[PDB]
Symmetry: D2
């Protein structure tokens, strides 16, 4: 069930299956705060970084090939998600993320030992690296991957479902609403083209932050000077990471001091996620209001059943609230760096990576299980638009503003269309024909589809 | 490996079809309810079964089976039987159904057939259950865990205020040299911030402890006994000892809004603000030693201030969670606020983080701090800020000359006065030591 | 047009060289102190002069001149004499010096020479004065203006809860059709939210009313009489009637932090959250008429312009709350240097909530009218009310009644009759008792 | 003193609808800022030009609006806009305010204008105020914020160059670390401001989108089909702001204000960067006796009043950012009704960051002086620099040197000599702190 690990202070107990060592177990017992550790994306990124560092240390003749091959093989297993249960240290740890860095070095040493290769976690696995430039690098690798490989395709899937609805509902005329009050006609297609643009603009916002989100601190070592690392370590590690992941957005930082003293790229990326959360709130709110009732609500559309409650718009608006909250935590940590190091990295990493994950997963669900299956109450929508006092204005040049206001008043009272009220009031004659009436009251033409 | 329901459910799972459908419908965060939430749902279901039995609405064999199964859930024996994502239907009905289904499967193992809705959810609705369990969990988190954790932090800071009562040092305003203070006076300030934090938590309890139970679907209590709420609350108070638990003052406000969670989050956010100031000052006091302030030494767990860093990161998380809670709080509609699982997640996490980090900070940082007493006194006695009480003896020009020479020669104000030959008829050595008494300048009680 | 100082100062200006240097140093927002902050600085200076006179530290002619000048400032007679930007030295020392110089110039017009620092700032420092005036202003804003404004809003919502006690309607959960409620019950919920809002403001007053006065530069009270703080607070409470004003429990906490403002902002933020829900429901209730819910009619000032003013004010309070907490957390050692920014935000939040709550109560809530027949018709036509028919016709026939009622756009009562269910098993009296929607709402 | 229309002040150029809005919203006692009033004047002048070009508005009427709108854009009528910021969420009241003021200016010149029929021709109550808001925000970003940030970047970069060899000890977790230069730290601050400019520039394609021509619900009903493109063309030619565009989607441009939320995010990130820069500078200037005493701030000892103004401004920008996002998310169907509140907060954030960045650059950064000898002494006395001695005296002796240096308050170099310990040239090469900082 358990095994004993030793260090200079004494002994610690670790689970039998654990690949971490005494130093990681000391960190576990030093930080019992949340009971929540690193996510799979952060763990993968630490694996990718350690493998790339071993490759570069081998290329520069600084690390023996047998040792480099063992690190590269161990780090590939971590990057493949084979050791997601080997990172037990709390998110709320030493602000540089040094404990999680040491945790990766210890797990790699234990994997290589199973294959008969002895690695020193610090001297070999952390060669040319420091306690301060490793965890922020893995954070920006994970955030860049989350943006490019997962969030942008998920948002594109949502944009395509909204755009398909904009096309399908192109002529589905309805009454507009401004200040929640009756307004001139629109189409359901036009409203959905608006939602599609919000998601398209969301993708543009994510893409615009990538030149700074993809900046890596690797090679800057303890304070950003690069002391105790080869002069080209950073450019070489980044080259290996780009070739292996296909993430061309990964780059060396423009300034090695800014890359460690601050995490401004995460604050910037969080702002884009927060704007997407704001867009999603508007889209989800309109959709659940459109599907409200049926008797006591708007009853414009029908949401797919998973009393049909709008459970996916509720999941979307709750996710948006979480992204807003995480955004405030990220900015707070971001502003409070000091001199050569910002020490809020594990907290900032947790929040940014969670915001990417929640937006990715909820956007795919919302697109597939809500948007794709929406059905419109076409006749009900057209009836309300054709019954609106807002459409009596094009009758003014035929019957006058006084008679047009009388038509509007009677239509509301008798719950009839403007067309039927004009007929019932005996206004069809030489001054206004039935064809002229239908042209003047063409609600689809008023929406200017 | 799995079983078929009228969906495929894992063989060792105690949940049934409705939970499995919720698992498939919401793969969003991959994180479900925490232990405190699961415990509160167990507490609520047991109290409801007790009241339904007391009112003769539920058969004793059925009631006993629910009470026994709910007690196991409240005891933390089934924390792996709640797989539904936090980001679910906004009323928390999925987690409510998850509890009813798990209770039905526990009772079935003991040969008692329970209908999850008709028996386990008897006199309850899909809307008054999850907010009740949320306010039970938040009230317990405040009373049983946060307040004792904050009291332990207050006591450690107050013990330091007492121990360092005469540890004179120079004050700092705008980060610049100021008149003397004691390290004890600064720590009395931190102790007051935590004491005020406890007062803030206590002040929110009359509204945090309000439970919606008995209001059913829309707050009217339709399909529940008229006294269901008062009876359930009486059972919960008797069993938990949590006297802060009460029926809501208004049953409509208790379901249409979660304002009690927004209010409680404000108190937690204020504590996070206080903890930021305390932790920042402590890591700055322990900074260096050569390039910093080197006022104190933090216990080793290069001695980095790792617990002040854990405290300030926790505070940032509490600030963030607070913004998410208020956002959800404001967006209720008509008879129901549908942001409850998200609000519950954030408020309960803020209680947990502040509880655990306050205890760690008190025990593993504050308790073991040591002051560089001689260094602190020498800097206070060398400060140009203390030349003002010399003015009435040597004039403000000569006092300014003393301040300038003391800084240049890196000497105390006392030594500079001696070195300038100012001891004489106009100023005796006893008069100088009385005028430059830095501890008396701090005016410690 | 101007006068020379040892700096060019405008001719009709009562401020002096230090204020003019501060005007030149901080051209950031173009916005100075508000009337409430100027008032509190005047109140503080007059109370300090009174205590310095009482202790024999300040000559009577000098004390009388300060007391007379400070009462003019507290009365709002010199609101155009405080030009320093909100974004100034974080202790608020510039605005403290601004008050001392304006008092000196007022006294000079009456032939009394006052030294702004030696006389007007006697027994005080650059650091315990502006936070004291801030907490005086915030306490007065809470007690004299916000709580009465919220009480007026609670009273208007409670009057509507009473008037609409029997106005039955259909409930809404997740925005979908639910069992009956009354408009009165919903408004009793809104009234409780505002009543709880008042309780929240009252609960923060023991810490909001704490004053730093007497703590001087670092909280030790050095260069002030030992009882200066208790005496100044005694004068302020006797003269203003604000009994919530008290000396700080800990003089170091009172200057190193502004946690009382962070706490008070939390209460204002919760009220903003409650007001958002109340205003959103009211504008949705008044929506349409054709394309909306058309439950009520809002008074024309028909766009819901007051609910829009309320929800925008609430957004501002949320924003100001984040700025206050940010400043609150970033104190260092003996002094929090974010006081003018924190003061600006907390006092604006008090003002906006006060003014919009009065407007909302008088010009929106008081004049609301309900579409009583429309509300009852929808409740009586809801499938949600077929459940009490189960013990007479069975849940299958009850579901068939619900389906037909929706399709034919009829009441449940009419559908039961049209389906020929009135007979020996169910009389017309038994049907009306079972489908009594007001009784289903279970109003008190 | 007052005229009847409602009682309106005699010298006021506004009319009955503005007076009713003054009476309806006594909430904050604060109206539109000069930038907002200017943008409304620019919009009305461009609309009159296009209505004249399309033959829809008589030349005498068009010339009168163009002249009156030019006076408003020039800041000649900033006292004629008394409606509270907290008004009808579309900003329709401030739109009518502009139409009424233009009508009264034209009347003084003998031209009768109908505020709605002429001044609001081809426009609605809903596409005008968001257009003026995005014009004002785009101008604030391009003409004022970016040049102010460039001024701050240039002052920080000049310090990074001047202090290129000013070696000092690094600080990580606030603890003693290996050497850096004051120039390297200032190059970091300069990059943060340079990245800040990139962040503002990246939001301009969406911040510059204007709703004009969308009318009531975004459909363009009761406006010429090319009204929007023509108005935008006139505004670009007259302001020189090539960033002003027609919206990509006319419905998104009125149902949401996502461009303001996005721009606020960039301003919030700059506030975050400025907090770090200002905090480091006031800590560097702290003491002198009880602090770090690394640099001396110019006097306006010396309190860091400009870093305090910067950190307070940053807190305000953070707060305004939360208010903007809150308003941004709560739109409904065809219109987001939080525009005046969002406009107030975004334009204030632009103004505060603009003004404080110029002050911080000119009156703080430019005049900073470094305590060069003190900084080098501490770096040369640090136990962090004993590591390059290990290959000469061993880790045990190198630790003994570090311990004795701290106790006797001496340099590592002096302690090595005092312990009788490796030539003097080899020692100076091994303990070269500037070489350890590896400056380019």
């Amino acid at each position: 069930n358990y095994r004993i690990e030793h260090d200079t202070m004494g002994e610690v107990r670790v689970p039998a299956k654990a690949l971490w060592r005494a130093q990681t177990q000391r960190a576990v017992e030093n930080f019992p705060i949340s009971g929540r550790g690193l996510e799979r994306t952060q763990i993968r990124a630490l694996g990718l970084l350690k493998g790339a560092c071993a490759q570069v240390n081998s290329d520069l003749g600084l690390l023996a090939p047998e040792k480099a091959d063992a690190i590269i093989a161990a780090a590939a297993e971590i990057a493949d998600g084979q050791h997601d249960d080997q990172f037990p240290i709390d998110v709320f740890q030493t602000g540089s993320g040094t404990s999680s860095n040491m945790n990766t070095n210890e797990v790699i040493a234990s994997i290589a030992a199973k294959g008969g290769v002895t690695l020193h976690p610090n001297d070999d696995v952390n060669m040319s690296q420091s306690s301060n430039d490793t965890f922020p690098t893995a954070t920006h690798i994970a955030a860049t991957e989350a943006a490019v490989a997962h969030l942008i395709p998920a948002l594109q899937q949502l944009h395509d479902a909204l755009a398909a609805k904009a096309l399908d509902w192109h002529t589905v005329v309805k009454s507009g609403r401004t200040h929640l009050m009756d307004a001139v006609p629109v189409t359901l297609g036009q409203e959905f083209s608006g939602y599609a643009r919000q998601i398209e603009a969301g993708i543009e916002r994510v893409r615009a932050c990538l030149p700074r989100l993809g900046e890596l601190a690797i090679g800057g070592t303890a304070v950003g000077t690069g002391l105790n690392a080869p002069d080209d370590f950073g450019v070489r590690v980044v080259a290996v990471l780009v070739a292996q992941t296909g993430l061309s957005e990964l780059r060396t930082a423009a300034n090695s001091f800014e890359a460690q003293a601050a995490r401004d790229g995460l604050v910037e990326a969080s702002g884009a996620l927060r704007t997407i959360a704001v867009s999603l709130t508007k889209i989800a709110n309109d959709i659940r209001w459109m599907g409200s009732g049926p008797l006591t609500g708007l009853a414009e559309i029908q949401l797919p059943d998973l009393k049909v409650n709008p459970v996916l718009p509720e999941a979307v608006t709750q996710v948006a609230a979480q992204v807003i909250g995480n955004d405030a935590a990220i900015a707070w940590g971001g502003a409070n760096g000091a001199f050569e190091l910002n020490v809020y990295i594990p907290m900032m990493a947790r929040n940014i990576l969670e915001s990417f994950k929640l937006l990715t997963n909820v956007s795919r669900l919302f697109a597939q299980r809500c948007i794709a299956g929406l059905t419109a109450n076409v006749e009900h929508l057209r009836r309300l638009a054709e019954s609106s006092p807002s459409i009596v204005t094009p009758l003014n040049s035929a019957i006058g503003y006084e008679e047009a206001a009388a038509v509007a008043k009677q239509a509301l009272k008798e719950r009839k269309t403007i067309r039927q009220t004009v007929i019932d009031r005996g206004l069809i004659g030489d001054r206004l024909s039935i064809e002229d009436l239908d042209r003047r009251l063409d609600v689809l033409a008023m929406a200017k589809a």
